[PDB]
Amino acid sequence: KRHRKVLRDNIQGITKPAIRRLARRGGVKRISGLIYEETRGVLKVFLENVIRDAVTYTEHAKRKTVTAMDVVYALKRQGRTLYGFG
Amino acid sequence: RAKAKTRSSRAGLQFPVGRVHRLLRKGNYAERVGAGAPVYLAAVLEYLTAEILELAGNAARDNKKTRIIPRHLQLAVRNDEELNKLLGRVTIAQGGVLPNIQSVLLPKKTES
Amino acid sequence: RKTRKESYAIYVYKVLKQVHPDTGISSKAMSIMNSFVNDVFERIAGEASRLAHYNKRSTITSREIQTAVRLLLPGELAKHAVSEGTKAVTCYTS
Amino acid sequence: MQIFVKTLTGKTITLEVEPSDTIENVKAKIQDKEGIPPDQQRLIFAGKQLEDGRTLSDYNIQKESTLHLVLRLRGC
Amino acid sequence: ARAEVHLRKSAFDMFNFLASKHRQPPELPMPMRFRHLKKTSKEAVGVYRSPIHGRGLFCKRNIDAGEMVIEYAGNVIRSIQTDKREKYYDSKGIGCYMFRIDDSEVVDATMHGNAARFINHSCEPNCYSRVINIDGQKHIVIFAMRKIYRGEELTYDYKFPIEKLPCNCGAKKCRKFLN
Amino acid sequence: NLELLESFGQNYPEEADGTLDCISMALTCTFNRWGTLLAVGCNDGRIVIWDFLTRGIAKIISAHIHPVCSLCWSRDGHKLVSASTDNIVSQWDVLSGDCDQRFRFPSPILKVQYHPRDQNKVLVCPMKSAPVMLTLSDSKHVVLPVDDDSDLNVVASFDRRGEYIYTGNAKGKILVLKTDSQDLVASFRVTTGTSNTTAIKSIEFARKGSCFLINTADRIIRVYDGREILTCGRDGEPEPMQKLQDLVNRTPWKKCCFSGDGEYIVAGSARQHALYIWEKSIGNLVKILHGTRGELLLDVAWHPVRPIIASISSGVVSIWAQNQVENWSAFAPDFKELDENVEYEERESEFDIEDEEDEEVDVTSV
Amino acid sequence: VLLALHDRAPQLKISDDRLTVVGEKGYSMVRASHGVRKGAWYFEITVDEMPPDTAARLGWSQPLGNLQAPLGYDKFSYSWRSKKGTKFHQSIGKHYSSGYGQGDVLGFYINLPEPHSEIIFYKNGVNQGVAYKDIFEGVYFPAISLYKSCTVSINFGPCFKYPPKDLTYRPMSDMG
Numbered sequence A: 001k002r003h004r005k006v007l008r009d010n011i012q013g014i015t016k017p018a019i020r021r022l023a024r025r026g027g028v029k030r031i032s033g034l035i036y037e038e039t040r041g042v043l044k045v046f047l048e049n050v051i052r053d054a055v056t057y058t059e060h061a062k063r064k065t066v067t068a069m070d071v072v073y074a075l076k077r078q079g080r081t082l083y084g085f086g
Numbered sequence B: 001r002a003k004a005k006t007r008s009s010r011a012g013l014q015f016p017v018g019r020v021h022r023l024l025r026k027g028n029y030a031e032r033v034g035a036g037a038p039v040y041l042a043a044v045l046e047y048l049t050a051e052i053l054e055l056a057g058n059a060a061r062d063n064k065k066t067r068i069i070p071r072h073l074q075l076a077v078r079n080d081e082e083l084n085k086l087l088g089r090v091t092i093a094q095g096g097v098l099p100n101i102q103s104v105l106l107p108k109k110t111e112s
Numbered sequence C: 001r002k003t004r005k006e007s008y009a010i011y012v013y014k015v016l017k018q019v020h021p022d023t024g025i026s027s028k029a030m031s032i033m034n035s036f037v038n039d040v041f042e043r044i045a046g047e048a049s050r051l052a053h054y055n056k057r058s059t060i061t062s063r064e065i066q067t068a069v070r071l072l073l074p075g076e077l078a079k080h081a082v083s084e085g086t087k088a089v090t091c092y093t094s
Numbered sequence D: 001m002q003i004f005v006k007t008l009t010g011k012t013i014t015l016e017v018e019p020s021d022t023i024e025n026v027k028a029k030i031q032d033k034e035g036i037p038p039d040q041q042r043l044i045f046a047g048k049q050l051e052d053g054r055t056l057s058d059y060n061i062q063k064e065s066t067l068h069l070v071l072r073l074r075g076c
Numbered sequence E: 001a002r003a004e005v006h007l008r009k010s011a012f013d014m015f016n017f018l019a020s021k022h023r024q025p026p027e028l029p030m031p032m033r034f035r036h037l038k039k040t041s042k043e044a045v046g047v048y049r050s051p052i053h054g055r056g057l058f059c060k061r062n063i064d065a066g067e068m069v070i071e072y073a074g075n076v077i078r079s080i081q082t083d084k085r086e087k088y089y090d091s092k093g094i095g096c097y098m099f100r101i102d103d104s105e106v107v108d109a110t111m112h113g114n115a116a117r118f119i120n121h122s123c124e125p126n127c128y129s130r131v132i133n134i135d136g137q138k139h140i141v142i143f144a145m146r147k148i149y150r151g152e153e154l155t156y157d158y159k160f161p162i163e164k165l166p167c168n169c170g171a172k173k174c175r176k177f178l179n
Numbered sequence F: 001n002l003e004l005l006e007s008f009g010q011n012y013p014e015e016a017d018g019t020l021d022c023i024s025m026a027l028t029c030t031f032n033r034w035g036t037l038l039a040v041g042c043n044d045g046r047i048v049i050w051d052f053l054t055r056g057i058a059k060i061i062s063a064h065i066h067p068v069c070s071l072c073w074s075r076d077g078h079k080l081v082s083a084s085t086d087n088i089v090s091q092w093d094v095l096s097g098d099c100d101q102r103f104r105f106p107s108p109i110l111k112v113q114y115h116p117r118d119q120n121k122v123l124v125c126p127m128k129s130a131p132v133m134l135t136l137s138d139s140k141h142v143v144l145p146v147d148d149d150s151d152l153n154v155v156a157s158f159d160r161r162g163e164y165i166y167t168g169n170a171k172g173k174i175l176v177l178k179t180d181s182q183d184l185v186a187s188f189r190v191t192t193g194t195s196n197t198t199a200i201k202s203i204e205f206a207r208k209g210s211c212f213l214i215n216t217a218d219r220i221i222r223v224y225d226g227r228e229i230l231t232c233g234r235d236g237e238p239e240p241m242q243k244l245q246d247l248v249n250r251t252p253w254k255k256c257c258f259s260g261d262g263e264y265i266v267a268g269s270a271r272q273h274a275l276y277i278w279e280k281s282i283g284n285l286v287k288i289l290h291g292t293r294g295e296l297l298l299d300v301a302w303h304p305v306r307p308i309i310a311s312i313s314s315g316v317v318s319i320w321a322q323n324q325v326e327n328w329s330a331f332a333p334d335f336k337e338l339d340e341n342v343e344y345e346e347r348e349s350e351f352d353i354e355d356e357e358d359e360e361v362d363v364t365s366v
Numbered sequence G: 001v002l003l004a005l006h007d008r009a010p011q012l013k014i015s016d017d018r019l020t021v022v023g024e025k026g027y028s029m030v031r032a033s034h035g036v037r038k039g040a041w042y043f044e045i046t047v048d049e050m051p052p053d054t055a056a057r058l059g060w061s062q063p064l065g066n067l068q069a070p071l072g073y074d075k076f077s078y079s080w081r082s083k084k085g086t087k088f089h090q091s092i093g094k095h096y097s098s099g100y101g102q103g104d105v106l107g108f109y110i111n112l113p114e115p116h117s118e119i120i121f122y123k124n125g126v127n128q129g130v131a132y133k134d135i136f137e138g139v140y141f142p143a144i145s146l147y148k149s150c151t152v153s154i155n156f157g158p159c160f161k162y163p164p165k166d167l168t169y170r171p172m173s174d175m176g
């Protein structure tokens, strides 16, 4: 046993001034009320498609920690290149 | 001096393994090449070729033709779900597209 | 007399007659399948070579090819191609 | 030299051979009279394996003796 | 309660399929789609306890107006064996389900068939059929008419010439007859 | 015992089928003779028994404080033998759970086993010293003499019939001993690699015949036949029936067992928690299985007469059998669900044709 | 003068010669429009090959029958079984006489002198049993329920192989 990992929330943990705040960094004037659920869905899809490749490189390297270079390598594969962590 | 069991039949495959080992030594991909990689890679390439040719043959029968012309290949890839995601940014020559008309461009009738 | 060139025509012929008895193939379809296998080979060998440079090793084993296939192919097709590869290698050993 | 080869199945088989024959002669004779695949003609000399790449006179068995074959898959 | 003399026992024939949880919701060329049909007709539909009359064929996947639904397949008979099989099925106390294709033959559904026997009748349908050619052997293919949602029991019209048996289904604008 | 008309193409396990989410902290697993029960040891020194047909938890018995790491069933299915770091020769009942034997003897034990026919003879494998055979009533203990005495890691067992005692050191030398008179009738060093020897982890046997397994430490499972050892006798040089390994991941193994019919071999990773199944005869992998992708495998069982496999990971015992498919004609055999146009004309006795018991069977027999 | 165009089962192997047919997958009772009303007329049925599970019912039927319906239902048609000699007519099961073999020269004769009938099973011109009597109004067509794939061939010409002994008929090459 010893492992307490019963987690159900944390899609709601991206709260609801936060998507409003991102939208008003984006230059958006007036928002409806279904944008919140749709944004949570799209964020879940994207973080799945990055964490999958991150854990794959971490396993293939035969380690247990996901260092920053592996995240940079996953995002390099995706096409969204990231600078400033190597 | 012994029996020349080629690495195709010694494995149980159909893709050659000598040509794969030559194109992994002479591609400057690494210095040293193992002796499980060209076998494993020949198997992967065979399975993908079988996967597309199954659906190609089904469509080729189902349009009542003998051979396979590339319109069947276009239909066989783009009807499937995972092969379309693999061949993401790919244009097959002489391909054509799926027949698709939107829902509002065609008329409908109300009276009588 | 011309200089001998590579092609994968005969092996597509053999797999086609193993999976369909009486269904031929054209010329253009053969060129498409040739370029398709060339594409998949280039992508997988590139991913394995990049893994080998990341891990500070120098040798393509089978392990890197398995990792490259698990990365590049989407989901269930990867879960079948891994089994195909492992079965072929284990029938090659003994 | 009429050797006996009684296997572990009660399958006794006889070959009247020379003491100076090779393994290939025994393979040909058993493959003639039974069609047994010759990748399983392993024999035992006081526990130890009788290897299939030498002659019969390299072991000096008493003439007209009894041996035992093992049903083996080698090249599947 | 065993000393009680409950005699609801045997007033109907032998068959059943009732008491199922019959509440799911409250709410290309030809042969390729024939392959699609043989694929997905199992996961599309379902037979459950109707409120109309006994059982019926429900619907679960949201169908667009025009696609194939199921093939109504069973044994294959000709025009002679009708009265003989009807006399046998009446002798054993079995309802007779048949469907004519054309001017040649009729497909049975009594002794061998599929999960497509169990569509009731209405006069405002949402299904029909045509005649196709899967290599000479023609077939009985269930098209659709409009966008059918989940939970709806399915219906189709029987093309009866108006010619005994009353209307034991109860549609809305029905003519109080099958014929 | 079960349905005989059931075999509509029976299979070999594919699915996950649901597990025992009841008590964690499992440590080992083994079935009885027929394949109806399963003893499972806890972490604190308890026993979990699960019945199969009812799918119900049979009995929970608290043995001691030391963790239970070795178990075996008697032939009738009434005497459980076990040993642990508690150093105690134990013997337990299945109707009561009684401490029938209690002898705290040192160098704690790694494996126990009954003689497969007499339950008087029991196996004891110490921490260091040579393996010991005992009796039940008195303390007649038989330590088998070992020429090595340098590994302090010797494995030994009894085979299917209990004819002989196959023994093995951690240098890879085998000393076959007769089961009662300790006759050293056969010996062989394992032909490991090119020349260099290896250790021996465990040795198990079958349910039908004399094919068995060798679990070395160079990642190579070897399969021999015991009658070949008998045909060799002393100074044997056996070469195996079939060799087993997976060089793709280079995976050393943790546990092996055979099928019920001696046809299939399962063996489990020590790294990936992924089970493999082999054919004995033709000699290839047939299926890879998976599970929770990051857990550490402990112990694998098999069910003899029916394709059911028990795993152990994170104290969870999985059960994998087909997720079997049910259909019609069991509710109504007069109707059979076809698929397409089936023609019915082959019989000719149609179109109005009209033509022109004595077995006494017992009812309370066996 | 060939096999029938109108009065045939359309799925039969009516080949380019239109004399030999392979039986289909039912009681394919093919008829012929060259059938008698009254008089003295006889032809042969030169059956050649008859595989097992390919039965054949022999008789004379009236034009208002069905192509797929087997012989011997009512007053239109009279049937009879190959094995065990068991005629079936008007929903009656009667094990009657001796059967036939395989690929013989069959063909029956019927006579209506100007109400009374000559109904005898003629197997190579041999008396094999009197089937029925007193036939009713209608034309009489040769109807054989060809059961499965068999090799039968109708005979037309005057070179009769087994003609009936001292029985008089106008030859069947004088109608078409």
Ligand SMILES: Nc1ncnc2c1ncn2[C@@H]1O[C@H](CSCC[C@H](N)C(=O)O)[C@@H](O)[C@H]1O
Pocket (backbone or CB within 6 Å): E052, E053, E054, E055, E056, E096, E097, E117, E118, E119, E120, E121, E122, E167, E168, E169, E170, E178
């Ligand atoms: N609404 C209705 N109530 C009773 N019978 C109906 C009906 N609509 C059609 N029928 C007749 O009854 C048959 C319906 S099949 C009835 C569904 C299924 N067999 C069941 O038992 O529940 C058809 O042959 C049709 O002729």
Ligand SMILES: [Zn+2]
Pocket (backbone or CB within 6 Å): E121, E122, E167, E168, E169, E170, E171, E174, E176, E177, E178
């Ligand atoms: Zn109605």
